Amino acid sequence: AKDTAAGHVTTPCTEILFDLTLAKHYENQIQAAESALNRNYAAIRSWTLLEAMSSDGNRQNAYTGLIAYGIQITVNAEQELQGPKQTKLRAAAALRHRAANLSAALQIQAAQQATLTKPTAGGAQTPFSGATGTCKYEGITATAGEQSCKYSTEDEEKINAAHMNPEVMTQITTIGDKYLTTITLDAIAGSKGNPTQSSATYAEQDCQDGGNPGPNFGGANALGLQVTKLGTKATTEKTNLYTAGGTECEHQPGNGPQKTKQRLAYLVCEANKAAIITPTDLQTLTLDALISAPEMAAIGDALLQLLKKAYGQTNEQFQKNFIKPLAAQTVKFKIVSNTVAALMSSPNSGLALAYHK
Amino acid sequence: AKDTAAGHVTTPCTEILFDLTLAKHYENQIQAAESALNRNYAAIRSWTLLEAMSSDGNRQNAYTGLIAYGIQITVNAEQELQGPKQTKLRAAAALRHRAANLSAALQIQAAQQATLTKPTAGGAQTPFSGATGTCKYEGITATAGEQSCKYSTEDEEKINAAHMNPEVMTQITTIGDKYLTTITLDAIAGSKGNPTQSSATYAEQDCQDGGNPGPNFGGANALGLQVTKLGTKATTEKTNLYTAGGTECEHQPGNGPQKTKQRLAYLVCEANKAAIITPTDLQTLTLDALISAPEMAAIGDALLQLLKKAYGQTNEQFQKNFIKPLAAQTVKFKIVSNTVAALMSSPNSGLALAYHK
Numbered sequence: 221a222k223d224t225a226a227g228h229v230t231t232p233c234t235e236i237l238f239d240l241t242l243a244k245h246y247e248n249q250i251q252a253a254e255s256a257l258n259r260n261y262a263a264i265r266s267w268t269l270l271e272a273m274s275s276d277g278n279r280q281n282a283y284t285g286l287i288a289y290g291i292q293i294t295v296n297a298e299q300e301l302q303g304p305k306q307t308k309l310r311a312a313a314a315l316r317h318r319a320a321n322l323s324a325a326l327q328i329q330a331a332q333q334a335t336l337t338k339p340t341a342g343g344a345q346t347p348f349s350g351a352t353g354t355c356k357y358e359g360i361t362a363t364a365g366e367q368s369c370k371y372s373t374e375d376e377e378k379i380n381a382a383h384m385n386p387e388v389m390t391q392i393t394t395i396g397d398k399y400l401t402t403i404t405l406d407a408i409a410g411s412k413g414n415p416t417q418s419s420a421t422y423a424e425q426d427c428q429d430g431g432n433p434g435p436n437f438g439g440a441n442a443l444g445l446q447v448t449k450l451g452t453k454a455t456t457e458k459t460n461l462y463t464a465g466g467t468e469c470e471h472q473p474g475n476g477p478q479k480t481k482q483r484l485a486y487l488v489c490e491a492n493k494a495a496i497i498t499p500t501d502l503q504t505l506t507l508d509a510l511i512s513a514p515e516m517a518a519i520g521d522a523l524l525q526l527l528k529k530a531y532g533q534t535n536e537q538f539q540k541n542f543i544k545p546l547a548a549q550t551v552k553f554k555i556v557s558n559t560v561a562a563l564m565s566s567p568n569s570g571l572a573l574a575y576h577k
Numbered sequence: 578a579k580d581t582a583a584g585h586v587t588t589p590c591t592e593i594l595f596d597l598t599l600a601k602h603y604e605n606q607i608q609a610a611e612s613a614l615n616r617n618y619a620a621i622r623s624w625t626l627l628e629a630m631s632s633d634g635n636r637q638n639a640y641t642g643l644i645a646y647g648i649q650i651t652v653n654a655e656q657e658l659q660g661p662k663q664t665k666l667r668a669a670a671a672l673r674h675r676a677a678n679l680s681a682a683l684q685i686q687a688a689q690q691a692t693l694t695k696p697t698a699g700g701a702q703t704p705f706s707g708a709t710g711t712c713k714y715e716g717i718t719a720t721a722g723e724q725s726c727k728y729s730t731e732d733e734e735k736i737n738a739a740h741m742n743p744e745v746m747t748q749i750t751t752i753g754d755k756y757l758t759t760i761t762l763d764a765i766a767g768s769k770g771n772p773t774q775s776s777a778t779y780a781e782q783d784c785q786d787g788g789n790p791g792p793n794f795g796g797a798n799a800l801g802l803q804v805t806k807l808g809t810k811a812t813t814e815k816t817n818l819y820t821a822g823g824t825e826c827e828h829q830p831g832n833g834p835q836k837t838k839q840r841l842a843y844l845v846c847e848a849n850k851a852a853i854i855t856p857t858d859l860q861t862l863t864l865d866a867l868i869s870a871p872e873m874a875a876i877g878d879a880l881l882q883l884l885k886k887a888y889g890q891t892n893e894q895f896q897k898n899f900i901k902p903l904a905a906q907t908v909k910f911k912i913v914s915n916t917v918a919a920l921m922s923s924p925n926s927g928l929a930l931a932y933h934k
C-alpha cells in the first residue's frame with residue numbers, strides 16, 4: 221500500500237509528526253550506515269593486531285587478506301555514502317525547519333479570544349470623518365496558552381518510519397500557506413442612541429453616556445465593538461514527489477518561483493532516491509560471504525579454493541580462526557589486559573600493536 | 578571584548594542571524610574535528626602501504642611506529658569527540674529551531690494591514706443585546722507579502738563566528754515571547770444617525786441607509802468599524818550563560834518550568850564549555866612533534882635518541898623519509914597507478930596493500 225503515512229496527515233499536528241518522523245528516518249539511515257562503517261574499521265584494527273600476533277606466514281597472509289578486503293570495501297562505502305548523506309541531510313533539515321514553522325504558526329493560530337482594552341470616545345475622526353460618534357480601541361490582544369500536539373496510538377503507528385521506505389511514498393501532504401501567513405478575525409460594532417465624544421463612561425469596555433450607563437448598553441447613548449473570534453482555518457494540500465513517468469523528481473528548482481510544499485517535495489524525492497549502500501559487516505562475516513565477495517578474487521590472487529585453504533573448508537573453521545577471536549581472545553601485556561576488539565578500540569590500541577610488532 | 582555578537586542582537590532578524598551563525602559555528606567545529614580524524618585515518622592507511630613496500634626491517638618498524646602512534650591518538654580523539662559532539666549538536670539543533678520559530682512569527686507579525694469584508698447589518702444581537710444597530714464583519718484578514726531579513730556589512734561582521742569563541746560569550750539576547758504568541762491590533766467603531774437592521778447598503782464596507790449612502794458615512798444612518806493596524810512590537814531580553822561564579826551553567830533544567838531563553842542559554846553554555854580536542858595532524862607531522870609526543874615513549878620502547886635513529890636526526894630527513902612519500906611517491910601495478918595517499922583512499926586501496934604484502 222502507498223502513502224499510509226502521508227495519507228494520515230490531516231491536521232497541523234499530524235503534518236508536524238510526519239515531517240519530524242521523516243527527518244529522523246533520514247538521519248537514522250545515515251547513523252546506521254556510519255555505525256556499519258565504524259564496526260568495519262574496528263574489525264580492521266582487530267585483524268591488524270591479530271596479524272602482528274601470528275607466527276605462521278600463511279596465517280599472517282590470511283589476516284592480511286581480511287585487512288585488505290575490509291579496507292577496500294569500507295573506504296569505498298564511506299566515499300559512496302557522502303552524496304546520499306548530504307542529500308538526505310538537506311531533506312531532514314528542511315523537514316525540521318518546516319515542522320518548526322508550523323508549530324510556531326499553530327501557537328499563534330490558537331490565539332482565538334481577544335482581550336479588549338478600555339476605549340476612548342470621540343466625534344468624527346480618521347477613518348470615520350463622517351461619524352458623530354467614534355469609540356477607539358488601542359492594543360486589543362489575543363494570546364493562547366501553551367499549545368501541544370497530542371497523538372493517538374494509531375497516529376504514531378501510521379506516521380512512522382516503518383511506512384517511510386521509498387517504495388511506498390508518492391506524495392506529501394502539507395498545511396496551506398495561509399495558516400502560516402494570515403490573521404483572520406470576526407468583529408462587530410454596536411450602537412444605541414446618539415454616541416458622541418461625551419460617551420466617556422468606559423466601565424463596560426465601550427463608550428456610553430446619558431441615563432444610567434451600564435451592562436448591555438445600559439446608557440442612553442452607546443458605541444462599541446468586540447472582536448468575537450480570531451484564527452485561520454488549516455487546509456491541506458497534496459504534492460506529488462515524482463513526475464507522471466514516476467522516475468524523475470517533480471518540482472526541480474531553477475524553473476521559476478516555487479511554493480514551500482514544492483521545495484519540500486523535491487527534497488524528499490531526492491532523499492528517497494538517494495539509496496544508501498551498506499557494505500558487508502566484517503565482524504559477522506561468514507566463510508561463504510568472504511569467498512563469494514568479488515574483491516577477494518584479486519586479493520586472494522595477490523596473497524595466495526586457495527581461499528578455502530587459507531580461511532577454512534567450513535564456516536565453523538572460519539568463525540573459529542578469524543571471527544570469534546575478536547570478542548573472546550584476551551590480550552595481556554605491560555609496557556593492559558583486554559579482548560582483541562575492545563583493545564583495538566581502546567586508548568591502548570596503538571600501543572598493543574607496537575608491543576606485538 | 579565580550580558579547581560583541583550578542584550585543585548586536587536588537588531585532589528579530591539579528592537574533593535569527595545570531596542563532597543561525599552560532600549553530601553553524603558548532604556544526605563547523607564538529608566537521609573540522611571529523612575532517613582532522615579522517616586525515617589521520619588516511620595517513621595510517623598510507624603508512625600501512627609503505628610498511629608493506631619496505632624491504633628493511635628497521636624501516637618497516639619505523640612505519641609501524643607511525644601506524645601505532647596514529648591509531649592510538651586518532652581512536653582516542655574520536656572517542657573523546659563524541660560527548661562534545663552531542664552537546665554541540667543539541668545546541669545547534671535548538672538554535673536552528675528557535676531561528677525557524679522567529680522567522681515564522683516575523684512573517685505573521687508583518688501582517689499589519691487588514692482587509693475588511695462586506696458586513697451584515699442587524700439590530701440587537703450577541704454580544705450587543707442592548708444595541709439598536711449592529712454591523713457584523715466575518716473573516717477580516719491580514720496578510721503580508723513575503724518577508725526577508727536584510728543584513729548590513731557590519732551586521733555580518735559583528736554577528737560572526739569570529740566573535741563566538743567561548744572566552745568572549747557571557748549572555749544571549751532574545752526576542753520576548755509575546756512576539757511569538759500574541760496578536761495585537763487597533764480598532765475603531767463609528768456611528769452616525771440611527772443605524773438599524775435597515776442599514777443594509779454595504780458599498781463602503783459599513784452599514785448605511787437613509788438619505789444618500791456613500792463615502793464617509795454619506796447616508797443618514799451609518800455604523801461600521803475598521804481594524805486600523807495589527808502587529809505586536811518585538812522587545813529584547815538578556816539571559817546570562819553562567820552563574821555568578823562564572824564557571825557553572827545557569828538555567829540547568831530539572832529545577833522548575835523554564836522559558837525558551839533559559840533553555841537556549843543552558844544549551845549554549847554547555848556547548849561552549851564542551852571544548853573539542855583535536856589530535857596532532859599526522860600528514861603534517863614534524864620530527865620534533867613526533868619524538869616529543871608522550872605516546873611515542875612506550876611505542877618506541879616497544880619497537881626500538883632511539884627515535885631519532887629510526888625517524889631521522891633532522892626534520893628534513895623525517896619529512897623526506899616519512900611525510901613527502903604520501904603525496905609524491907607513485908605506486909603502479911596491475912592485477913593501477915597512483916600516489917600513495919590517494920591510492921590508499923581509493924577503490925584500489927585494499928588491493929594495493931594485498932599486492933605488495
Ligand SMILES: *[C@@H]1O[C@H](CO)[C@@H](O[C@@H]2O[C@H](CO)[C@@H](O[C@@H]3O[C@H](CO[C@H]4O[C@H](CO)[C@@H](O)[C@H](O[C@H]5O[C@H](CO)[C@@H](O)[C@H](O)[C@@H]5O)[C@@H]4O)[C@@H](O)[C@H](O[C@H]4O[C@H](CO)[C@@H](O)[C@H](O)[C@@H]4O[C@H]4O[C@H](CO)[C@@H](O)[C@H](O)[C@@H]4O)[C@@H]3O)[C@H](O)[C@H]2NC(C)=O)[C@H](O)[C@H]1NC(C)=O
Nearest residue numbers: 314317318321473474475476477478480680681684724725
Ligand atoms: C519556514 O518559514 C520561514 C518564514 O516564513 C520561511 O522563510 C522564508 O523563506 C523564503 C523562501 O526561501 C524566503 O524567500 C526568499 O527570499 C530570498 C531573499 O529575498 C530578498 O533578497 C533578494 C536579494 O538577495 C531580493 O531580490 C528580494 O527582493 C525581491 O523579492 C521581494 C519579495 O518577493 C520583492 O518584494 C522585491 O521587489 C524583489 O523582487 C528580497 O529582498 C529570495 O532570494 C528568494 O527567491 C527565490 O524564491 C522566490 C520564491 O520564494 C522566487 O520568486 C525568486 O525568483 C527566487 O527564485 C528563483 O531562484 C531560486 C533559487 O534561489 C530557484 O530555485 C527558483 O526556481 C527561481 O528560479 C526567496 O524569495 C523568505 O525571505 C524567508 N523569510 C524569512 C522571514 O526568513 C522558510 O522558507 C520556511 N521553511 C520551510 C522549510 O518551510
Ligand SMILES: *[C@@H]1O[C@H](CO)[C@@H](O[C@@H]2O[C@H](CO)[C@@H](O[C@@H]3O[C@H](CO[C@H]4O[C@H](CO)[C@@H](O)[C@H](O[C@H]5O[C@H](CO)[C@@H](O)[C@H](O)[C@@H]5O)[C@@H]4O)[C@@H](O)[C@H](O[C@H]4O[C@H](CO)[C@@H](O)[C@H](O)[C@@H]4O[C@H]4O[C@H](CO)[C@@H](O)[C@H](O)[C@@H]4O)[C@@H]3O)[C@H](O)[C@H]2NC(C)=O)[C@H](O)[C@H]1NC(C)=O
Nearest residue numbers: 323324327367368671674675678830831832833834835837
Ligand atoms: C519553537 O516554537 C515551538 C512552538 O511554540 C515551541 O514548541 C513548544 O515547546 C514547548 C516547550 O518544549 C512545549 O511544551 C512542552 O509540552 C510538553 C507536553 O505537554 C503536553 O503533554 C504532557 C504529557 O506528556 C501534559 O502533561 C501537558 O499538560 C500539562 O501542561 C499543560 C500546559 O501547561 C496544562 O494545560 C495541563 O493542564 C497540564 O498541566 C501537555 O498536555 C510538556 O511535557 C513540557 O513540560 C515541561 O516544561 C514546562 C514549561 O514549558 C513545565 O511547566 C513542565 O513542568 C515541564 O517541565 C518540567 O520538566 C522538564 C523536563 O521535561 C524540566 O526540564 C523542567 O525544569 C520542569 O521540571 C512543555 O510544556 C510545547 O508543547 C511546544 N508546542 C508545540 C505546538 O509544539 C518550541 O519550544 C520552540 N523551540 C525553540 C527552540 O524556541
